[PDB]
Amino acid sequence: VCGPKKSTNLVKNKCVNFNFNGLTGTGVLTESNKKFLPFQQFGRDIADTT
Amino acid sequence: NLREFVFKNYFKIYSKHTPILPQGFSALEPLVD
């Protein structure tokens, strides 16, 4: 259940302000080599952050 | 065939299917909400 927002394109390998389904933060987006399972949406670090 | 399920409370179903109650370890994953 998402709000009336217009989505845009994703910019890789640069410092960006991101919003994924309401989840926001600042960081560089790069290709992952993490073996995500079919039911998993995101992963976390030891600090319990994305 | 060994089939394992978790039925728990809304209601969620987790499961695992492996070839072969035998001793061993694996973790079941959610399939149906």
Curated annotation (Swiss-Prot), chain B:
Effect of residue 3 to S: In strain: Gamma/P.1
Effect of residue 27 to V: In strain: 20A.EU1
Domain of life: Viruses
Phenotype when changing residue 3 to K: Partial loss of biliverdin affinity
Complex formation: Binds to host ACE2. RBD also interacts with the N-linked glycan on 'Asn-90' of ACE2. Cleavage of S generates a polybasic C-terminal sequence on S1 that binds to host Neuropilin-1 (NRP1) and Neuropilin-2 (NRP2) receptors. Interacts with host integrin alpha-5/beta-1 (ITGA5:ITGB1) and with ACE2 in complex with integrin alpha-5/beta-1 (ITGA5:ITGB1). May interact via cytoplasmic c-terminus with M protein. May interact (via N-terminus) with host bilirubin and biliverdin, thereby preventing antibody binding to the SARS-CoV-2 spike NTD via an allosteric mechanism.
Protein's job: Attaches the virion to the cell membrane by interacting with host receptor, initiating the infection. The major receptor is host ACE2. When S2/S2' has been cleaved, binding to the receptor triggers direct fusion at the cell membrane. When S2/S2' has not been cleaved, binding to the receptor results in internalization of the virus by endocytosis using host TFRC and GRM2 and leading to fusion of the virion membrane with the host endosomal membrane. Alternatively, may use NRP1/NRP2 and integrin as entry receptors.
Protein name: Spike protein S1
UniProt organism field: Severe acute respiratory syndrome coronavirus 2 (2019-nCoV)
Name of encoding gene: S
